[PDB]
Design an enzyme around this catalytic site. Structure first.
Site, PDB file in Angstrom:
ATOM      1  N   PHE A  65       0.860  -1.213   0.000  1.00 40.84           N
ATOM      2  CA  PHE A  65       0.000   0.000   0.000  1.00 40.84           C
ATOM      3  C   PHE A  65       0.889   1.253   0.000  1.00 40.84           C
ATOM      4  CE2 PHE A  65      -2.186   3.475   2.151  1.00 40.84           C
ATOM      5  CZ  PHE A  65      -3.136   3.735   1.195  1.00 40.84           C
ATOM      6  N   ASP A  66       1.799   1.352   0.962  1.00 38.53           N
ATOM      7  CA  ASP A  66       2.721   2.513   1.072  1.00 38.53           C
ATOM      8  C   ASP A  66       4.125   2.066   0.633  1.00 38.53           C
ATOM      9  OD1 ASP A  66       3.836   4.945   1.555  1.00 38.53           O
ATOM     10  OD2 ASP A  66       3.475   4.961   3.710  1.00 38.53           O
ATOM     11  N   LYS A  67       4.300   1.814  -0.655  1.00 39.43           N
ATOM     12  CA  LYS A  67       5.593   1.309  -1.170  1.00 39.43           C
ATOM     13  C   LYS A  67       6.753   2.298  -0.933  1.00 39.43           C
ATOM     14  CE  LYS A  67       3.865  -1.619  -5.017  1.00 39.43           C
ATOM     15  NZ  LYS A  67       4.777  -2.785  -5.048  1.00 39.43           N
ATOM     16  N   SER A  87       7.306  -2.793  -1.145  1.00 40.16           N
ATOM     17  CA  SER A  87       8.733  -3.198  -1.268  1.00 40.16           C
ATOM     18  C   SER A  87       9.604  -2.067  -1.838  1.00 40.16           C
ATOM     19  CB  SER A  87       8.810  -4.413  -2.150  1.00 40.16           C
ATOM     20  OG  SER A  87       8.190  -5.549  -1.618  1.00 40.16           O
ATOM     21  N   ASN A 112      -2.650  -8.154  -8.938  1.00 46.45           N
ATOM     22  CA  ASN A 112      -1.692  -7.069  -9.230  1.00 46.45           C
ATOM     23  C   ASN A 112      -0.389  -7.603  -9.832  1.00 46.45           C
ATOM     24  OD1 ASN A 112       0.902  -6.255  -7.587  1.00 46.45           O
ATOM     25  ND2 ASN A 112      -0.425  -7.383  -6.179  1.00 46.45           N
ATOM     26  N   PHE A 116       7.343  -4.207  -8.702  1.00 45.72           N
ATOM     27  CA  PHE A 116       8.226  -3.481  -7.760  1.00 45.72           C
ATOM     28  C   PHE A 116       8.503  -2.069  -8.271  1.00 45.72           C
ATOM     29  CE2 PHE A 116       8.780  -7.934  -6.823  1.00 45.72           C
ATOM     30  CZ  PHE A 116       8.861  -7.974  -5.455  1.00 45.72           C
ATOM     31  N   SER A 181       9.231 -13.584  -2.110  1.00 47.33           N
ATOM     32  CA  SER A 181       7.891 -14.128  -2.477  1.00 47.33           C
ATOM     33  C   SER A 181       7.055 -13.263  -3.457  1.00 47.33           C
ATOM     34  CB  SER A 181       7.099 -14.395  -1.174  1.00 47.33           C
ATOM     35  OG  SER A 181       6.861 -13.223  -0.427  1.00 47.33           O
ATOM     36  N   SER A 182       7.595 -12.210  -4.091  1.00 48.42           N
ATOM     37  CA  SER A 182       6.802 -11.518  -5.147  1.00 48.42           C
ATOM     38  C   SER A 182       6.699 -12.451  -6.354  1.00 48.42           C
ATOM     39  CB  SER A 182       7.401 -10.257  -5.625  1.00 48.42           C
ATOM     40  OG  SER A 182       6.603  -9.703  -6.654  1.00 48.42           O
ATOM     41  N   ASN A 184       5.902 -11.314  -9.265  1.00 48.26           N
ATOM     42  CA  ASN A 184       5.962 -10.298 -10.347  1.00 48.26           C
ATOM     43  C   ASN A 184       7.414  -9.943 -10.715  1.00 48.26           C
ATOM     44  OD1 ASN A 184       3.037 -10.268 -10.291  1.00 48.26           O
ATOM     45  ND2 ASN A 184       3.083  -8.834  -8.603  1.00 48.26           N
ATOM     46  N   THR A 185       8.422 -10.646 -10.201  1.00 47.31           N
ATOM     47  CA  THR A 185       9.808 -10.313 -10.661  1.00 47.31           C
ATOM     48  C   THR A 185      10.686 -11.569 -10.715  1.00 47.31           C
ATOM     49  OG1 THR A 185       9.620  -7.950 -10.301  1.00 47.31           O
ATOM     50  CG2 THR A 185      11.781  -8.694 -10.566  1.00 47.31           C
ATOM     51  N   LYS A 214       9.474 -13.128   4.188  1.00 50.55           N
ATOM     52  CA  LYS A 214       8.104 -13.208   3.707  1.00 50.55           C
ATOM     53  C   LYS A 214       8.021 -14.239   2.581  1.00 50.55           C
ATOM     54  CE  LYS A 214       4.258 -10.310   2.038  1.00 50.55           C
ATOM     55  NZ  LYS A 214       3.795  -8.895   2.000  1.00 50.55           N
ATOM     56  N   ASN A 243       2.605 -13.785   1.059  1.00 53.21           N
ATOM     57  CA  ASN A 243       2.431 -12.878  -0.074  1.00 53.21           C
ATOM     58  C   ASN A 243       1.193 -13.297  -0.888  1.00 53.21           C
ATOM     59  OD1 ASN A 243       3.070 -10.882  -2.150  1.00 53.21           O
ATOM     60  ND2 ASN A 243       5.214 -11.070  -1.507  1.00 53.21           N
TER      61      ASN A 243
HETATM   62  C1  LIG Z   1      -1.535  -4.066  -4.968  1.00 51.76           C
HETATM   63  C2  LIG Z   1      -0.672  -4.869  -4.062  1.00 51.76           C
HETATM   64  C3  LIG Z   1       0.677  -4.621  -3.973  1.00 51.76           C
HETATM   65  C4  LIG Z   1       1.506  -5.347  -3.171  1.00 51.76           C
HETATM   66  N1  LIG Z   1       2.820  -5.097  -3.110  1.00 51.76           N
HETATM   67  C5  LIG Z   1       3.620  -5.791  -2.301  1.00 51.76           C
HETATM   68  C6  LIG Z   1       5.103  -5.573  -2.163  1.00 51.76           C
HETATM   69  O1  LIG Z   1       5.665  -4.701  -2.753  1.00 51.76           O
HETATM   70  N2  LIG Z   1       5.782  -6.344  -1.343  1.00 51.76           N
HETATM   71  C7  LIG Z   1       5.215  -7.257  -0.601  1.00 51.76           C
HETATM   72  O2  LIG Z   1       5.907  -7.927   0.107  1.00 51.76           O
HETATM   73  N3  LIG Z   1       3.920  -7.548  -0.679  1.00 51.76           N
HETATM   74  C8  LIG Z   1       3.088  -6.889  -1.460  1.00 51.76           C
HETATM   75  N4  LIG Z   1       1.712  -7.171  -1.501  1.00 51.76           N
HETATM   76  C9  LIG Z   1       1.181  -8.253  -0.708  1.00 51.76           C
HETATM   77  C10 LIG Z   1       0.518  -7.765   0.551  1.00 51.76           C
HETATM   78  O3  LIG Z   1       1.493  -7.198   1.360  1.00 51.76           O
HETATM   79  C11 LIG Z   1      -0.168  -8.971   1.218  1.00 51.76           C
HETATM   80  O4  LIG Z   1       0.790  -9.936   1.507  1.00 51.76           O
HETATM   81  C12 LIG Z   1      -1.295  -9.611   0.376  1.00 51.76           C
HETATM   82  O5  LIG Z   1      -1.900  -8.770  -0.554  1.00 51.76           O
HETATM   83  C13 LIG Z   1      -2.277 -10.373   1.258  1.00 51.76           C
HETATM   84  O6  LIG Z   1      -2.978  -9.590   2.108  1.00 51.76           O
HETATM   85  P1  LIG Z   1      -4.395  -9.032   1.732  1.00 51.76           P
HETATM   86  O7  LIG Z   1      -5.075 -10.130   1.206  1.00 51.76           O
HETATM   87  O8  LIG Z   1      -4.920  -8.547   2.957  1.00 51.76           O
HETATM   88  O9  LIG Z   1      -4.181  -7.968   0.819  1.00 51.76           O
HETATM   89  C14 LIG Z   1       0.896  -6.410  -2.354  1.00 51.76           C
HETATM   90  C15 LIG Z   1      -0.462  -6.664  -2.459  1.00 51.76           C
HETATM   91  C16 LIG Z   1      -1.278  -5.936  -3.274  1.00 51.76           C
HETATM   92  C17 LIG Z   1      -2.764  -6.213  -3.376  1.00 51.76           C
HETATM   93  C1  LIG Z   2      -5.095  -1.359  -5.125  1.00 55.08           C
HETATM   94  C2  LIG Z   2      -5.420  -0.322  -4.062  1.00 55.08           C
HETATM   95  O1  LIG Z   2      -4.539   0.148  -3.447  1.00 55.08           O
HETATM   96  N1  LIG Z   2      -6.800   0.059  -3.833  1.00 55.08           N
HETATM   97  C3  LIG Z   2      -7.206   1.033  -2.841  1.00 55.08           C
HETATM   98  C4  LIG Z   2      -6.559   1.203  -1.621  1.00 55.08           C
HETATM   99  C5  LIG Z   2      -7.010   2.144  -0.726  1.00 55.08           C
HETATM  100  C6  LIG Z   2      -8.115   2.898  -1.037  1.00 55.08           C
HETATM  101  C7  LIG Z   2      -8.618   3.923  -0.047  1.00 55.08           C
HETATM  102  C8  LIG Z   2      -9.006   4.761   0.667  1.00 55.08           C
HETATM  103  C9  LIG Z   2      -9.351   5.932   1.559  1.00 55.08           C
HETATM  104  C10 LIG Z   2     -10.642   6.173   1.971  1.00 55.08           C
HETATM  105  C11 LIG Z   2     -10.897   7.251   2.795  1.00 55.08           C
HETATM  106  C12 LIG Z   2      -9.867   8.081   3.189  1.00 55.08           C
HETATM  107  C13 LIG Z   2      -8.577   7.834   2.761  1.00 55.08           C
HETATM  108  N2  LIG Z   2      -7.473   8.682   3.141  1.00 55.08           N
HETATM  109  C14 LIG Z   2      -8.319   6.759   1.945  1.00 55.08           C
HETATM  110  C15 LIG Z   2      -8.771   2.739  -2.239  1.00 55.08           C
HETATM  111  C16 LIG Z   2      -8.316   1.800  -3.138  1.00 55.08           C
HETATM  112  O1  LIG Z   3       5.182  -5.159  -6.864  1.00 57.98           O
HETATM  113  C1  LIG Z   3       4.472  -6.223  -7.094  1.00 57.98           C
HETATM  114  O2  LIG Z   3       4.026  -6.512  -8.187  1.00 57.98           O
HETATM  115  C2  LIG Z   3       4.260  -7.144  -5.962  1.00 57.98           C
HETATM  116  C3  LIG Z   3       5.220  -7.449  -5.043  1.00 57.98           C
HETATM  117  C4  LIG Z   3       4.932  -8.392  -4.014  1.00 57.98           C
HETATM  118  O3  LIG Z   3       5.723  -8.757  -3.135  1.00 57.98           O
HETATM  119  N1  LIG Z   3       3.663  -8.937  -4.042  1.00 57.98           N
HETATM  120  C5  LIG Z   3       2.686  -8.657  -4.965  1.00 57.98           C
HETATM  121  O4  LIG Z   3       1.579  -9.192  -4.929  1.00 57.98           O
HETATM  122  N2  LIG Z   3       3.023  -7.754  -5.925  1.00 57.98           N
END
Ligand SMILES: Cc1cc2nc3c(=O)[nH]c(=O)nc-3n(C[C@H](O)[C@H](O)[C@H](O)COP(=O)(O)O)c2cc1C
Ligand SMILES: CC(=O)Nc1ccc(C#Cc2cccc(N)c2)cc1
Ligand SMILES: O=C(O)c1cc(=O)[nH]c(=O)[nH]1
Ligand SMILES: [Cl-]
Length: 355
Positions: A65-67, A87, A112, A116, A181-182, A184-185, A214, A243
Site C-alpha cells: 500500500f505505502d511502497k 517493497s 496485481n 516493484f 515471495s513476489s 511479479n519479478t 516473507k 504474499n
Molecule cells: C496491490 C498490491 C501490492 C503489493 N505489493 C507488495 C510488495 O511490494 N511487497 C510485498 O511484500 N507484498 C506486497 N503485496 C502483498 C501484501 O502485502 C499482502 O501480503 C497480500 O496482498 C495479502 O494480504 P491481503 O489479502 O490482505 O491484501 C501487495 C499486495 C497488493 C494487493
Molecule cells: C489497489 C489499491 O490500493 N486500492 C485502494 C486502496 C485504498 C483505497 C482507499 C481509501 C481511503 C478512503 C478514505 C480516506 C482515505 N485517506 C483513503 C482505495 C483503493
Molecule cells: O510489486 C508487485 O508486483 C508485488 C510485489 C509483491 O511482493 N507482491 C505482490 O503481490 N506484488
C-alpha cells in the site's frame, strides 16, 4: 457501525466505479498522507510484545500500500498497530506497464503485477530521515515501523540488493522484511539470509532491526521444510505468511480472473491460514509469524492468530471497505477473544496447536 456502513455500502463502491484500481490506490496514498481520514480505543487485550517491540494492537497495514513511505503517519491515524512500507528496491524503477492492477469485486479479490515500482532506497531513506525522531517516539509508544526490501529487475546479485537495503534503511526500521515471495519479478536461501543477517549485525545497536522473511502461499511441502530449517538454523527473527498467490482457486467469478499477477483478498485467506499453521508447526512455535492474506474481520484475524500468528496485516480489505475496516477488525477481534476465553491476544497465539 456508522461510518463502516457508509464506506462499505456506498462510498467505496462509488469510488470503484469512478477510478481504476491504480488511480484509486494513488489517491488513497495522497489523502492518507494528508490526514484526510474518517474521524476504537486501544485496550490492553490487543497489546502484543514480539520482535523486541511493543505493538499497541496486532493489526498492521501490509506491504504494497505505502511502497515509498509517504503515508506512515496517516496509517497510524487510521488505527494500524504497525506499518510496513515497501517493497523498496536499491535503485528507482518504474515497474510493469499499465494497466497492472485489477479488481475482482465478485470475489472480494485483487490481482496485481506492479513489478516493484519503487522510488529507490535513497529517496525513501531521506523520506524516513525527515521523520526519524517522530518515529522513535511512535515505536516507544507501541507503534513500530517495518521496511520491506526488494531487488531491482536487472540486478545481477540478488543478495547484494538485499544487503544494500539492510545498510541503507535498516537503521530507520524496527524490522526488515526480505521479500523472496513476489510473483511479479536451500543452501542458496541460506547464502542470502547469512549475508542479510551479517549486514544487520554490523549496524549500531540502537539501529539494529529484526529481520523477517516473507514467503508465498505457493510453496511445495519441501520448500516449507527447507525454509523452516534455515530460519531456525540462522536465527531468523520471524516470518511473514503470506504474499499473494499465483494460483487461481476454483470458483473465481471476476471477469479478470485470468490476468497475470498475484491474487489477494478473500480467495487467498484460508490458503494463507493453512501456510501459517504449517510454518508454526515446522518451527515449533518458536518463530514469530505475521499472518497476512484475506483478513477483513475479527474472525479472519483470530483464525490466523489461533493458527500461529502473533500479528496480522491486511491490505485488499482496505480497498473494498475503506479505512473504517481497521476499527472493525479490532472491535470484532477483542469481542471474539472474550467470547472464547482468551485473556488477550497473547494467549490466543497458536491456541489451535494445543487443543
Ligand atoms: C496491490 C498490491 C501490492 C503489493 N505489493 C507488495 C510488495 O511490494 N511487497 C510485498 O511484500 N507484498 C506486497 N503485496 C502483498 C501484501 O502485502 C499482502 O501480503 C497480500 O496482498 C495479502 O494480504 P491481503 O489479502 O490482505 O491484501 C501487495 C499486495 C497488493 C494487493
Ligand atoms: C489497489 C489499491 O490500493 N486500492 C485502494 C486502496 C485504498 C483505497 C482507499 C481509501 C481511503 C478512503 C478514505 C480516506 C482515505 N485517506 C483513503 C482505495 C483503493
Ligand atoms: O510489486 C508487485 O508486483 C508485488 C510485489 C509483491 O511482493 N507482491 C505482490 O503481490 N506484488
Ligand atoms: Cl473462499
Amino acid at each position: 457501525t456508522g461510518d463502516e456502513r457508509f464506506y462499505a455500502e456506498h462510498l467505496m463502491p462509488t469510488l470503484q466505479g469512478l477510478l481504476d484500481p491504480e488511480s484509486a490506490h494513488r489517491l488513497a496514498v495522497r489523502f492518507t498522507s494528508l490526514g484526510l481520514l474518517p474521524r476504537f480505543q486501544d485496550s490492553d487485550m490487543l497489546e502484543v510484545r514480539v520482535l523486541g517491540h511493543k505493538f499497541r494492537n496486532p493489526v498492521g497495514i501490509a506491504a504494497g500500500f505505502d511502497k515509498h513511505g509517504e503515508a506512515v503517519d496517516g496509517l497510524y491515524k487510521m488505527g494500524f498497530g504497525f506499518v510496513e512500507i515497501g517493497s523498496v528496491t536499491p535503485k528507482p524503477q518504474e515497474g510493469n506497464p499499465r494497466p497492472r492492477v485489477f479488481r475482482l469485486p465478485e470475489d472480494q479479490a485483487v490481482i496485481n503485477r506492479y513489478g516493484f515500482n519503487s522510488h529507490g532506497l535513497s529517496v525513501v531513506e531521506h523520506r524516513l530521515r525527515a521523520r526519524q525522531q517522530k518515529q522513535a517516539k511512535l515505536t516507544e509508544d507501541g507503534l513500530p515501523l517495518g521496511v520491506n526490501l526488494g531487488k531491482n529487475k536487472t540486478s545481477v546479485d540478488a543478495a547484494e540488493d538485499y544487503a544494500e537495503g539492510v545498510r541503507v534503511l535498516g537503521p530507520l526500521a524496527d524490522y526488515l522484511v526480505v521479500n523472496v515471495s513476489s510473483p511479479n519479478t536451500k543452501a542458496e536461501l541460506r547464502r542470502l539470509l547469512t549475508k542479510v543477517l551479517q549486514e544487520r549485525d554490523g549496524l549500531r545497536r540502537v539501529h539494529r532491526p529484526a529481520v523477517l522473511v516473507k514467503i508465498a502461499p505457493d510453496l511445495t511441502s519441501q520448500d516449507k521444510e527447507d525454509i523452516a530449517s534455515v530460519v531456525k538454523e540462522l536465527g531468523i527473527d520471524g516470518l511473514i505468511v503470506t504474499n499473494t498467490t499465483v494460483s487461481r482457486p476454483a470458483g473465481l467469478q471476476g471477469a479478470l480472473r485470468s490476468e497475470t499477477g498475484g491474487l489477494s483478498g478473500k480467495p487467498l485467506r484460508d490458503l494463507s491460514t493453512q501456510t501459517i499453521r504449517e510454518m508454526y508447526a515446522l518451527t515449533q512455535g518458536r518463530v514469530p509469524i505475521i499472518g497476512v492474506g484475506g483478513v477483513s474481520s475479527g474472525q479472519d484475524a483470530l483464525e490466523k492468530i489461533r493458527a500461529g500468528a502473533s500479528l496480522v496485516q491486511l491490505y485488499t480489505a482496505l480497498t473494498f471497505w475503506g479505512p473504517p475496516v481497521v476499527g472493525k477488525v479490532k472491535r470484532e477481534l477483542e469481542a471474539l477473544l472474550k467470547e472464547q476465553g482468551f485473556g488477550g491476544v497473547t494467549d490466543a497465539i497458536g491456541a489451535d496447536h494445543r487443543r
